[PDB]
Write a structure and sequence with these properties.
part of a larger assembly, 6 chains, A alpha/beta (about 425), B mainly alpha (about 100), C mainly alpha (about 90), D mainly alpha (about 60), E alpha/beta (about 350), B: about 100 residues, C: about 90 residues, mainly alpha, Histone, subunit A, binds S-adenosyl-L-homocysteine, binds zinc ion, DNA-binding, palmitate (chain B)
Chain lengths: ~425, ~100, ~90, ~60, ~350, ~70
DNA sequence: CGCGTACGTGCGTTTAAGCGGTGCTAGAGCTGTCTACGACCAATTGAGCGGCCTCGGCACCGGGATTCTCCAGGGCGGCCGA
DNA sequence: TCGGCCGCCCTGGAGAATCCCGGTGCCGAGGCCGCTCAATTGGTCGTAGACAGCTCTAGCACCGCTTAAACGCACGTACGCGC
């Protein structure tokens, strides 16, 4: 109401659109809107952190990209776009009745996609990916090669031992690989694929500082806590402080136990992963506890999956843009087997059945999902585990080439094959 | 499977929450008044009562019965049951020392 | 000063004492955890009665607890005792 | 009773408020044990065995 | 035989280590932790147990030196928590002196006096490390043991209170100086935006206290939050590894965390909780669980206190919530062993 | 000795008449025999012949002495 | 109805309650003096109760959020006994 | 051989009831006023109680025998409890 009245003074050439917060109409303009012309208040910036990369079960965004609220949104018809625009924002910044006019357009393109750049009072700056990139963005020296040693890796909430597989693919010599896990299927996977070399512990809630000390020094501590109780798109979520969210704190403890003391300058590195859909207070508390700001890395650059994840850690050069390698499969069609056709160009895991086979809507294959996530083929085919269990295992797992990108400079710090 | 139906635990416990959170009288006023008059017929013929006297009798009688069903429910729980029985009321009144 | 603090006299109530008080009470079979609970209940009962009787002695400006103060302390708690003067 | 009235979002003490005020306190309940307060009711206190088990099996 | 142990040293020319100074016995298992001399095995076992045990009535339930129940006196200088029996004082320094000591409440005890040689008492230099070795040999449990802080090398306590204020308590307990506000306690209601840089700016901390909300659920934030933030800021406030500095902590739960959160807290704080019941007013009043690394805090729990009765009290308190004060007085006592670590304001 | 120990908490340097201690003993034994009679009724009601602390707690709950 | 544990029974030990003396002394109990504290009575007034009034705190009505409650279902699956 | 049936997890969706939120209305409580009788003040007697003194009763303390009973250990079968 008040915001709508203000926008009146904006179009009467009495107020600059760049001087008003186009999300909620607050006067406390501090930052500029990264996607379009206008200002942004701090409160809306926090809302913008949570809501932009939230997707519903249909594979489209949960909320409007502009105001990061809205009660009824317009979905986008154009290929590979997942954005939504709430009716209210469209009926202000573009013009009155433009929203219902977009409702009636059966082949409709949203304003983020359409070829033209000017749309009424709404203007889109062309540098929005780079500004968005920067918006979401004790140093050890290099060790000389002869002094390099095999890496020792602790992987908490190890899952299917993706980290050891990545280090093997990079040809780094692994002295030992200790892994905490509770799911029998996931325990089996590591044993088989890595030939018994993986020391399986059990419940991470049994792991003491004494255990960590007597297991010998660790060179790399890695992990991803369960995201079911952190991800905001779960209505029944218990947050960071209840249910399975609190396993992150156990990770924080064992990382603290595994970190060298001050004055001991031996090389040590860590990587923690979580979903982008994590709450403002949850994300803030995690970011404060790990004493760093997260780097946001999207799988779509190197892994042909729309999987935007936060990575806390101290791996060197982890800000540098992702450079694809020829080995990597940037296309979903370059991962499916012959006779199957990809609906979309990227799979969505944070149409429901993204396969066209024999003019029929088929579901995603487990092995094709393996190839998408960058795992060497038939990695999770070890025991007599259900399709549901293998799907859940691949879903919770890391994107392999993203982990290869992050782990890549560790080759300059430990012994290589 | 169109008409909805609850469980025997649910509706009973909702009634327990409803009648614990309320204060009003549960016995009807006129049958309780006829009961008080018929009991008073034996001790003296042709009484008269005040409305406040009958309401005071009803307040004290309902409070006495609610405390009695509290001890009755404890006696029922102690015998590994949930259903109260006349054994429970006789036990509660025999431990209160009122069997005379 | 010249008064040793008496202690652990709740164990002076022996197991056969509670056994005989359960025989007079008509009890046929006594469990092993009866005795601590019975000592606790007897201790709380003596706490209440002596808490009344010492206050009756206090107001009388004496230092001797009489049998009449015990009878007054019990008759106040609705347990009228006979044989000691009402 | 003023605390029990403020909890119930009321600025007038009804006998329910005196009932909750006396019976929640332990020394006032010891003082007024054999005392009935008219239009009081009882305390909202349900035993922990008559409720259905709203739990989940860990295995 | 208590006037004989003052005769075996002076006349027979024997070593104090060769006589049990507790019960007068001639059989010596080990060497006494606080002073030079020997201790028989039962007195040794009981002496260790007595330190763990916490008494509401006095600084020590049973006597320090000989572990007797009665004949307890209070230390003169209020910055000391030591308590000795009358029979130890009579037997060692001489008859008719215990009465003189007990007669005043301002009589300087043996550890506060400039000279520690009274006539039959010998102090130990850097005794706390030897004391840790004493716990290591027989106590079967290596409980968290920070070096003791001498009176001469004493520091003003730097306190960080999270989610609950204790300035009134510590002021009543003599940890914070009244009248003068240099700011040796910082109360921080909201800590979501606290950073290591902030804590470094706030000055180095020696004691960080946290506590759960009171039973009236004042705030609409899950109670585990207090625990987890307490752990985080705790780790931040720990001194740089390889530094002789005391760091104490205590997280207190007034039965607001269920068994899940209880095990979680017990795992992070790496010990079992401490359940404390309050003075019965007929049946049971309220109770509180406490994690800490402060000496004689783990043994404060009383085995008589059952879980089911505690669950019933919790559910009668949570639903009723008549009183809504944080039980400051309940958790007030537990800091009492800490008295010998920081300066006391009378 | 139990009566003197319980009396030492309320007042120091007390003094009992022998008839007062005998009256306390008569009243306490009669109270315990009545309590074991109600405890025996609570034991029989639960289809048992063994009294348990549950029976003493139930008897003192129905009497109204949990206060 | 099955199982197992824990309580009653019995015998040998030893712990101390009970009884019978003495002592002494703290303290209950009685008696004598007296004085200050409360009953009684007269004056007098202002605080407390009957009566009036007016107005807002709460009872009731109506609508939306919501929130536990009950049941369908996917799948699954294997397994299984038909 | 081989296809069709009961736990298990997981999940949530209709759905009847309940909590919250407003809107209206009413009657009961808060506040004002007269008045009148009970609270107050002043004074006076009379005896209840405070206090000194004496005495002499019983209460506490100690000690030494003496068995009565409390304790401790084995053991086995009857009852508590789970199904
Ligand atoms: N309490 C616990 N203790 C140990 N592991 C647990 C756990 N709770 C959940 N987990 C495991 O931790 C995993 C976190 S999902 C992360 C999987 C892993 N990062 C990967 O790349 O495969 C889950 O698969 C779950 O099986
Ligand atoms: Zn804004
Ligand atoms: Zn919008
Ligand atoms: Zn689009
Ligand atoms: Zn000894
Ligand atoms: Zn001292
Ligand atoms: Zn001593």
């Amino acid at each position: 109401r008040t915001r709508e009245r203000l926008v009146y003074e904006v179009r009467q050439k009495c107020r600059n659109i760049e001087d008003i917060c186009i999300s909620c109409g607050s006067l406390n303009v501090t930052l500029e809107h990264p996607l379009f012309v206008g200002g942004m208040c701090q409160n809306c910036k926090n809302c913008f952190l949570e809501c932009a990369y939230q997707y519903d079960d249909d594979g489209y965004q949960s909320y409007c990209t502009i105001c990061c609220g809205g009660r009824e949104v317009l979905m986008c018809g154009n290929n590979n776009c997942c954005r939504c625009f709430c009716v209210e924002c469209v009926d202000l910044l573009v013009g009155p009745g433009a929203a219902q006019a977009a409702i009636k357009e059966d082949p409709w393109n949203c304003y983020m996609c359409g070829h033209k750049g000017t749309y009424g009072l709404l203007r889109r700056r062309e540098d929005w990916p780079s500004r968005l990139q920067m918006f979401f963005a004790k140093v050890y020296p290099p060790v000389p090669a002869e002094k390099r040693k095999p890496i020792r890796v602790l992987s908490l909430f190890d899952g299917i031992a993706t980290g050891l597989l990545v280090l093997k693919d990079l040809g780094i010599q692994v002295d030992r690989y200790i892994a905490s896990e509770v799911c029998e299927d996931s325990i089996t996977v590591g044993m088989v694929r890595h030939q018994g070399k993986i020391m399986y512990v059990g419940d991470v809630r049994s792991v003491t500082q004494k255990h960590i000390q007597e297991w010998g020094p660790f060179d790399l501590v890695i992990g991803g806590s369960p995201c079911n109780d952190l991800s905001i798109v779960n209505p029944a979520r218990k947050g960071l402080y209840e249910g399975t969210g609190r396993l992150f704190f156990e990770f924080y403890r064992l990382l603290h136990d595994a970190r060298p003391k001050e004055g001991d300058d031996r090389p040590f590195f860590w990587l923690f992963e979580n979903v982008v859909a994590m709450g403002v207070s949850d994300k803030r508390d995690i970011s404060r506890f790990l004493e760093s700001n997260p780097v946001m890395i999207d799988a779509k650059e190197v892994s042909a999956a729309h999987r935007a994840r936060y990575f806390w850690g101290n791996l060197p050069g982890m800000n540098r843009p992702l450079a694809s390698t020829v080995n990597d499969k940037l296309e979903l069609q370059e991962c499916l087997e012959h006779g199957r056709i990809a609906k979309f160009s990227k799979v969505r895991t944070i149409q429901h059945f993204p396969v066209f086979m024999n003019e029929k809507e088929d579901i995603l294959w487990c092995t094709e999902m393996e190839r998408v996530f960058g795992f060497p083929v038939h990695y999770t085919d070890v025991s007599n585990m259900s399709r549901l269990a293998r799907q859940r295992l691949l879903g919770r797992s890391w994107s392999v080439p993203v982990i290869r990108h992050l782990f890549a400079p560790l080759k300059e710090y430990f012994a290589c094959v | 499977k169109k008409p909805h139906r609850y469980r025997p635990g649910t509706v009973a416990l909702r009634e327990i929450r409803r009648y614990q959170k309320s204060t009003e009288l549960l016995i009807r006023k006129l049958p309780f008044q006829r009961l008080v008059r018929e009991i008073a017929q034996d001790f003296k013929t042709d009484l008269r009562f005040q409305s406040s006297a009958v309401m005071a009798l009803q307040e004290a009688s309902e409070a006495y019965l609610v405390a009695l069903f509290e001890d009755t429910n404890l006696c029922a729980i102690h015998a590994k049951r949930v259903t109260i029985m006349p054994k429970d009321i006789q036990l509660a009144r025999r431990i209160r020392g009122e069997r005379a | 000063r010249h008064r040793k603090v008496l202690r652990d006299n709740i164990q002076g109530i022996t197991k056969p004492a509670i056994r005989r008080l359960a025989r007079r009470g008509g009890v046929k079979r006594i469990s092993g955890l009866i005795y601590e609970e019975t000592r606790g209940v007897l201790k709380v009962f003596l706490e209440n009665v002596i808490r009344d009787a010492v206050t009756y002695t206090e107001h009388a400006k004496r230092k001797t607890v009489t049998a009449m103060d015990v009878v007054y302390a019990l008759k106040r708690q609705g347990r009228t005792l006979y044989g000691f003067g009402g | 009773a003023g605390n029990a009235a403020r909890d119930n979002k009321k600025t007038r003490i009804i006998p329910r408020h005196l009932q909750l005020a006396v019976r929640n306190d332990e020394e006032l309940n010891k003082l007024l044990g054999r005392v009935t307060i008219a239009q009081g009711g009882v305390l909202p206190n349900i035993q922990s065995v008559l409720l259905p088990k709203k739990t989940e099996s860990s295995k | 035989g208590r006037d004989l142990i003052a005769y075996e040293v002076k006349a027979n020319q024997r070593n104090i280590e060769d006589i049990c100074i507790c019960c007068g016995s001639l059989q010596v298992h080990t060497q006494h932790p606080l002073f030079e001399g020997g201790i028989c095995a039962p007195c040794k076992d009981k002496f260790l147990d007595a330190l763990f045990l916490y008494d509401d009535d006095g600084y020590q339930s049973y006597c320090s030196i000989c572990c007797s129940g009665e004949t307890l006196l209070i230390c003169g200088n209020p910055d000391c928590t030591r308590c000795y029996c009358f029979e130890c004082v009579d037997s060692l320094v001489g008859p008719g002196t215990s009465g003189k000591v007990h007669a005043m409440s301002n009589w300087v005890c043996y550890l506060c006096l400039p000279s520690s040689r009274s006539g039959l008492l010998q102090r130990r230099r850097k005794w706390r490390s030897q004391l840790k070795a004493f716990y290591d040999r027989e106590s079967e449990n290596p409980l968290e043991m920070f070096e003791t802080v001498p009176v001469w090398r004493r520091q003003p306590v730097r306190v960080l209170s999270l989610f609950e204020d204790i300035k009134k308590e510590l002021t009543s307990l003599g940890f914070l100086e009244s009248g003068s506000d240099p700011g040796q306690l910082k109360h921080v209601v909201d800590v979501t935006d606290t950073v290591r840089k902030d804590v470094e700016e706030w000055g180095p901390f020696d004691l960080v206290y946290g506590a759960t909300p009171p039973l009236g659920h004042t705030c609409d934030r899950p109670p585990s939050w207090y625990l987890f933030q307490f752990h985080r800021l705790l780790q931040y406030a720990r001194p740089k590894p390889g530094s002789p500095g005391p760091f104490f902590w205590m997280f207190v739960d007034n039965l607001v965390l269920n068994k899940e959160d209880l095990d979680v807290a017990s795992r992070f704080l790496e010990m079992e909780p401490v359940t404390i019941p309050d003075v019965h007013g007929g049946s049971l009043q309220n109770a509180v669980r406490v994690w800490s690394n402060i000496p004689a805090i783990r043994s404060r729990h009383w085995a008589l206190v059952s879980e089911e009765e505690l669950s019933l009290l919790a559910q009668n308190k949570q639903s009723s919530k008549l009183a809504a004060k944080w039980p400051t007085k309940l958790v007030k006592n537990c800091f009492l062993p800490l008295r010998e670590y920081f300066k006391y304001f009378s």
